[PDB]
């Protein structure tokens, strides 16, 4: 469709590195009456309507990040996406200035190449209120490793379910895009009572596979 | 507030004559705004400049330390500022800030605030000027408020003209009626768009302790385009003047070129009653244009079936079509669609077809390329407009409707309208182009996709129309309004294009069923059939006639009486029925006690 | 271009109606067709619906033809949502795109050329599917204990429960440390509502050093709280 769609859904540059916003469109975008071609780069945050910030897809226009736009090619495009944890991280795709139906799709979100250092793994029990301790029972933690680069087991009552924890994470705690994260054996509040002999096991993109130790609730 | 504010009109002046001239003078006995100003009744308010001002102030010490003129006097654009340093006048053209009571009064080193210039603070000083002693000439006379500084400021042809005079005063807050003439001082070339101004007190509260003296009085009166007669003496001095607008005696003695008039009756001007309203009348609505065929076929033409016409002698519903919620897009290349709702033309050319939603990009008047050039593209020389609406729901099919084919390329058809319509293998500039043999080629894709396809595919039915402008009769128009009728008043009017100014009346004037309007023996028109009611109206001209002034000698009295020749006093003024006194300046140059004679009112 | 503004972030319940608010002006809603924001706020709000607020003329993809159906909110010169069959499509960002710059000295609804992708953007708003239970005062005293947190990888946090929104007023950690913001939102648990296992980077050496706050709800839950607890 002429709501032109990004290919990557999120970007992948290193610090200052020259990654690309790959994209695709409908038909006859380099049109015979207009000749400047209708694809233009969208360059703005999620939740906004997609706003045109690189007219005719050769370079960034005014108010674009400059590292976030580049070569269009008819039904296809490949903009620059340099250092895309920042700068080109303003969410971006090719988009039509074409006619009534013309738009950008979801756009590639901000993302970058990152560190993946090993998370912790040992006894992970609830507090003294273990009889309602919920999804954070049998829990693990990580730092200096990317949000998609560290993960945890559902090790409730020492069941050792590797990689199966419910989890959350945040951007670089260490400068090499090296994030922080935590995860645990997912359950409703009262299910932590059976889980209370809780282990933790965890793994990462630059780390070994999940392995664990365990202890009773109200203790380390 | 009168007989102030006459100035020598220019530099060409000459001896001992009555000269009658037109300019932005201050009209006699107009009400001047007296800014009586005292301590708590205090400020330097911004005032609109209009066509120019008479300005005056009760003064000596240059308490009115200056003026600022411009569009804004504070932001962006240039402004003229005029300041009394203690010796002299300063002029600048700079775009000053002036957010408050204006106190940016910084000045150059050589006699600061006293001789060399003041308000240095701004960013575009394209003109600067130093005068000599033009604040000492004010300070020469004895005691503040016992004198009037008197000025005219007018702006025309990119010049600010400044005229002044300076005279004694007895009342510190009044503007006396004594005649005096202002001399020219400057013709400043600065080109500034002046529309507002303010006086400058520059935080002063004079040591001339009349009230503690955060206080003065100053006066503003607007100039107006008026005819003055000016009386010169043997030294080339203006010695007297007459505002010819003021009253019927002033008009009389201007017309006679004299300051004294003998007992008699004199003809001076023509009375001519202005219209109160406007009456436009048109027939029963009829002859609606045949757009339903082009626009509202149940299944539209393909690109190659392309139904097309030209249309004439009809009333265009285009206001409704423009007002319609339907169309996915419409564009005019010609004059705006908003006026095609009501505009008139010699004829229209009109046609309709279909596109896959994407190709609507190329179809317009003003737009050309290998899509539209080879199935429909019109010449861009008409008032062309284009409209699109949903094929996606109606004459589409889910496969792409294979009857609603794509455009049929034929590169060599360069001529407008011809822009190859045809269902033929013909794509090249000039190769043999039979049916399908290896010499020649045909694009044959499907245009008409259904509404569940992506919003690019979603096809439009499309209409183009093209209005034609000529000096020849405009056989197409939008619908036209008919007003209420207005009997027994002087009005403007229009029948079916028979326009005039007159008094419409009911009539006994019997005439035949086929007749629209009566001439008279002069062959001017005198009666019309109302096109909507079929009323038989009679038309007569709005009242007019000579105006004559009856006077004793001005030697004996300045009372006058006025005769409006030939008219009925019923048509004459909204008067105030005193004998002797004409309320003339406002009321009809006349305005009072009434009597009727066969000579007129 | 337009007097661009957007608002009216709301949860769209499965199969119900959907609504939104915007402001607009000039060419961006009258010469060029404005775009209905018709993609999730995890991305740019793609123009799957196309509209003219100054005329009621519209075009859509056939999900968005209902799920982000729009009407002229004439007091703002701009679209207000009036959608139906609410779901993940109706969970699109609460926005209206002031259309691309006018392609000519044209007149009327002339956008046969120029896109619905914005020349002016109203900043938009959030949205989601309203399937989660309208609750969340529940809280759960567990997180990575001293052994499981193990030095510089360690965190402070708590389990949310029964929440309508995933973001919680308790923020998992009790503010005791902040080496990395890993106390991210809850996820929909088997209770039909948000529950959590996230924690922000902090010392593991005791349950008090990794101190926590546990209530799952916020303003969209009608049950927001920050009641305290710990790991281990
Ligand atoms: C003109 O009229 C105003 C009120 O409209 C009055 O304050 C002012 O004093 C009048 N002018 C003169 C010269 O009295
Ligand atoms: C003069 O200035 C006023 C006030 O800014 C403005 O409204 C007007 O259009 C200007 N006219 C010209 C000819 O610049
Ligand atoms: C511009 O406008 C502001 C309005 O408050 C005023 O304070 C300022 O003095 C003006 N001039 C400049 C040059 O900023
Ligand atoms: C001065 O005036 C010109 C217009 O005459 C304007 O373009 C310029 O920006 C102004 N400069 C400053 C510094 O105010
Ligand atoms: C002209 O001006 C002189 C100035 O000295 C004056 O004496 C004379 O009376 C004036 N009038 C005539 C008619 O000369
Ligand atoms: C048409 O003519 C008739 C004549 O009786 C009149 O009553 C009617 O008002 C006219 N209608 C229009 C639409 O002009
Ligand atoms: C009929 O009239 C409408 C309203 O003006 C117009 O938009 C539409 O294109 C026409 N054709 C059909 C088949 O409805
Ligand atoms: C239709 O025309 C009238 C003219 O008075 C106008 O008030 C109205 O807003 C227009 N409506 C549409 C939908 O164009
Ligand atoms: C005319 O006026 C003069 C004074 O200017 C006077 O001597 C004479 O008597 C007057 N005559 C009449 C008839 O008014
Ligand atoms: C003048 O108007 C009156 C009504 O005010 C009228 O009676 C009279 O016939 C009209 N004509 C003449 C010549 O008086």
PDB file of N, CA and C in Angstrom, chain B residues 464-502:
ATOM      1  N   UNK B 464     -14.256  15.846 -15.340  1.00  0.00           N
ATOM      2  CA  UNK B 464     -13.577  17.101 -15.659  1.00  0.00           C
ATOM      3  C   UNK B 464     -14.581  17.997 -16.359  1.00  0.00           C
ATOM      4  N   UNK B 465     -14.547  19.283 -16.039  1.00  0.00           N
ATOM      5  CA  UNK B 465     -15.317  20.296 -16.742  1.00  0.00           C
ATOM      6  C   UNK B 465     -14.483  21.556 -16.916  1.00  0.00           C
ATOM      7  N   UNK B 466     -14.892  22.402 -17.844  1.00  0.00           N
ATOM      8  CA  UNK B 466     -14.014  23.391 -18.448  1.00  0.00           C
ATOM      9  C   UNK B 466     -14.831  24.545 -18.999  1.00  0.00           C
ATOM     10  N   UNK B 467     -14.929  25.606 -18.204  1.00  0.00           N
ATOM     11  CA  UNK B 467     -15.729  26.782 -18.519  1.00  0.00           C
ATOM     12  C   UNK B 467     -14.996  27.698 -19.515  1.00  0.00           C
ATOM     13  N   UNK B 468     -15.739  28.323 -20.430  1.00  0.00           N
ATOM     14  CA  UNK B 468     -15.190  29.107 -21.541  1.00  0.00           C
ATOM     15  C   UNK B 468     -15.542  30.600 -21.457  1.00  0.00           C
ATOM     16  N   UNK B 469     -14.529  31.463 -21.399  1.00  0.00           N
ATOM     17  CA  UNK B 469     -14.698  32.906 -21.215  1.00  0.00           C
ATOM     18  C   UNK B 469     -14.444  33.675 -22.525  1.00  0.00           C
ATOM     19  N   UNK B 470     -15.435  34.469 -22.936  1.00  0.00           N
ATOM     20  CA  UNK B 470     -15.481  35.257 -24.175  1.00  0.00           C
ATOM     21  C   UNK B 470     -16.232  36.576 -23.918  1.00  0.00           C
ATOM     22  N   UNK B 471     -16.046  37.574 -24.786  1.00  0.00           N
ATOM     23  CA  UNK B 471     -16.908  38.767 -24.838  1.00  0.00           C
ATOM     24  C   UNK B 471     -18.328  38.470 -25.377  1.00  0.00           C
ATOM     25  N   UNK B 472     -18.507  37.333 -26.055  1.00  0.00           N
ATOM     26  CA  UNK B 472     -19.791  36.832 -26.535  1.00  0.00           C
ATOM     27  C   UNK B 472     -20.752  36.474 -25.369  1.00  0.00           C
ATOM     28  N   UNK B 473     -22.078  36.387 -25.605  1.00  0.00           N
ATOM     29  CA  UNK B 473     -23.078  36.193 -24.554  1.00  0.00           C
ATOM     30  C   UNK B 473     -22.783  35.011 -23.619  1.00  0.00           C
ATOM     31  N   UNK B 474     -22.806  35.265 -22.312  1.00  0.00           N
ATOM     32  CA  UNK B 474     -22.502  34.271 -21.290  1.00  0.00           C
ATOM     33  C   UNK B 474     -23.689  33.314 -21.075  1.00  0.00           C
ATOM     34  N   UNK B 475     -23.799  32.276 -21.911  1.00  0.00           N
ATOM     35  CA  UNK B 475     -24.975  31.389 -21.917  1.00  0.00           C
ATOM     36  C   UNK B 475     -25.064  30.432 -20.728  1.00  0.00           C
ATOM     37  N   UNK B 476     -24.026  30.334 -19.894  1.00  0.00           N
ATOM     38  CA  UNK B 476     -24.101  29.619 -18.615  1.00  0.00           C
ATOM     39  C   UNK B 476     -23.750  30.536 -17.452  1.00  0.00           C
ATOM     40  N   UNK B 477     -24.438  30.349 -16.333  1.00  0.00           N
ATOM     41  CA  UNK B 477     -24.245  31.084 -15.084  1.00  0.00           C
ATOM     42  C   UNK B 477     -24.624  30.204 -13.895  1.00  0.00           C
ATOM     43  N   UNK B 478     -24.081  30.457 -12.706  1.00  0.00           N
ATOM     44  CA  UNK B 478     -24.726  29.982 -11.475  1.00  0.00           C
ATOM     45  C   UNK B 478     -26.095  30.655 -11.238  1.00  0.00           C
ATOM     46  N   UNK B 479     -26.937  30.130 -10.331  1.00  0.00           N
ATOM     47  CA  UNK B 479     -28.198  30.770  -9.951  1.00  0.00           C
ATOM     48  C   UNK B 479     -27.972  32.181  -9.390  1.00  0.00           C
ATOM     49  N   UNK B 480     -28.980  33.051  -9.519  1.00  0.00           N
ATOM     50  CA  UNK B 480     -28.922  34.460  -9.095  1.00  0.00           C
ATOM     51  C   UNK B 480     -30.043  34.803  -8.112  1.00  0.00           C
ATOM     52  N   UNK B 481     -29.741  35.655  -7.136  1.00  0.00           N
ATOM     53  CA  UNK B 481     -30.659  36.067  -6.069  1.00  0.00           C
ATOM     54  C   UNK B 481     -31.676  37.112  -6.551  1.00  0.00           C
ATOM     55  N   UNK B 482     -32.927  36.999  -6.104  1.00  0.00           N
ATOM     56  CA  UNK B 482     -33.912  38.083  -6.175  1.00  0.00           C
ATOM     57  C   UNK B 482     -34.178  38.672  -4.790  1.00  0.00           C
ATOM     58  N   UNK B 483     -34.084  39.991  -4.664  1.00  0.00           N
ATOM     59  CA  UNK B 483     -34.378  40.737  -3.435  1.00  0.00           C
ATOM     60  C   UNK B 483     -35.877  40.945  -3.251  1.00  0.00           C
ATOM     61  N   UNK B 484     -36.252  41.463  -2.085  1.00  0.00           N
ATOM     62  CA  UNK B 484     -37.537  42.139  -1.919  1.00  0.00           C
ATOM     63  C   UNK B 484     -37.636  43.341  -2.868  1.00  0.00           C
ATOM     64  N   UNK B 485     -38.862  43.723  -3.209  1.00  0.00           N
ATOM     65  CA  UNK B 485     -39.161  44.951  -3.938  1.00  0.00           C
ATOM     66  C   UNK B 485     -39.260  46.140  -2.966  1.00  0.00           C
ATOM     67  N   UNK B 486     -38.894  47.353  -3.398  1.00  0.00           N
ATOM     68  CA  UNK B 486     -38.923  48.572  -2.567  1.00  0.00           C
ATOM     69  C   UNK B 486     -39.611  49.714  -3.338  1.00  0.00           C
ATOM     70  N   UNK B 487     -40.943  49.797  -3.266  1.00  0.00           N
ATOM     71  CA  UNK B 487     -41.727  50.890  -3.871  1.00  0.00           C
ATOM     72  C   UNK B 487     -41.459  52.235  -3.176  1.00  0.00           C
ATOM     73  N   UNK B 488     -41.670  53.342  -3.887  1.00  0.00           N
ATOM     74  CA  UNK B 488     -41.720  54.712  -3.352  1.00  0.00           C
ATOM     75  C   UNK B 488     -40.443  55.227  -2.660  1.00  0.00           C
ATOM     76  N   UNK B 489     -39.270  54.679  -2.974  1.00  0.00           N
ATOM     77  CA  UNK B 489     -37.977  55.235  -2.556  1.00  0.00           C
ATOM     78  C   UNK B 489     -37.030  55.350  -3.745  1.00  0.00           C
ATOM     79  N   UNK B 490     -36.126  56.327  -3.736  1.00  0.00           N
ATOM     80  CA  UNK B 490     -35.012  56.339  -4.677  1.00  0.00           C
ATOM     81  C   UNK B 490     -34.086  55.162  -4.374  1.00  0.00           C
ATOM     82  N   UNK B 491     -33.876  54.259  -5.324  1.00  0.00           N
ATOM     83  CA  UNK B 491     -33.069  53.045  -5.160  1.00  0.00           C
ATOM     84  C   UNK B 491     -32.211  52.797  -6.389  1.00  0.00           C
ATOM     85  N   UNK B 492     -31.138  52.031  -6.237  1.00  0.00           N
ATOM     86  CA  UNK B 492     -30.594  51.303  -7.376  1.00  0.00           C
ATOM     87  C   UNK B 492     -31.487  50.103  -7.691  1.00  0.00           C
ATOM     88  N   UNK B 493     -31.530  49.677  -8.947  1.00  0.00           N
ATOM     89  CA  UNK B 493     -32.323  48.523  -9.335  1.00  0.00           C
ATOM     90  C   UNK B 493     -31.720  47.770 -10.518  1.00  0.00           C
ATOM     91  N   UNK B 494     -32.112  46.507 -10.663  1.00  0.00           N
ATOM     92  CA  UNK B 494     -31.831  45.665 -11.812  1.00  0.00           C
ATOM     93  C   UNK B 494     -32.990  44.693 -12.080  1.00  0.00           C
ATOM     94  N   UNK B 495     -33.568  44.785 -13.273  1.00  0.00           N
ATOM     95  CA  UNK B 495     -34.413  43.756 -13.884  1.00  0.00           C
ATOM     96  C   UNK B 495     -33.514  42.615 -14.437  1.00  0.00           C
ATOM     97  N   UNK B 496     -33.878  41.957 -15.537  1.00  0.00           N
ATOM     98  CA  UNK B 496     -32.977  41.119 -16.328  1.00  0.00           C
ATOM     99  C   UNK B 496     -31.890  41.954 -17.037  1.00  0.00           C
ATOM    100  N   UNK B 497     -30.979  42.564 -16.286  1.00  0.00           N
ATOM    101  CA  UNK B 497     -29.849  43.336 -16.817  1.00  0.00           C
ATOM    102  C   UNK B 497     -30.162  44.792 -17.183  1.00  0.00           C
ATOM    103  N   UNK B 498     -31.435  45.186 -17.236  1.00  0.00           N
ATOM    104  CA  UNK B 498     -31.832  46.592 -17.265  1.00  0.00           C
ATOM    105  C   UNK B 498     -31.598  47.192 -15.873  1.00  0.00           C
ATOM    106  N   UNK B 499     -30.428  47.801 -15.704  1.00  0.00           N
ATOM    107  CA  UNK B 499     -29.979  48.470 -14.480  1.00  0.00           C
ATOM    108  C   UNK B 499     -30.264  49.959 -14.505  1.00  0.00           C
ATOM    109  N   UNK B 500     -30.558  50.541 -13.347  1.00  0.00           N
ATOM    110  CA  UNK B 500     -30.628  51.992 -13.203  1.00  0.00           C
ATOM    111  C   UNK B 500     -30.705  52.469 -11.759  1.00  0.00           C
ATOM    112  N   UNK B 501     -30.919  53.772 -11.605  1.00  0.00           N
ATOM    113  CA  UNK B 501     -31.236  54.430 -10.336  1.00  0.00           C
ATOM    114  C   UNK B 501     -32.546  55.186 -10.506  1.00  0.00           C
ATOM    115  N   UNK B 502     -33.525  54.988  -9.631  1.00  0.00           N
ATOM    116  CA  UNK B 502     -34.840  55.606  -9.791  1.00  0.00           C
ATOM    117  C   UNK B 502     -35.786  55.307  -8.644  1.00  0.00           C
TER     118      UNK B 502
END
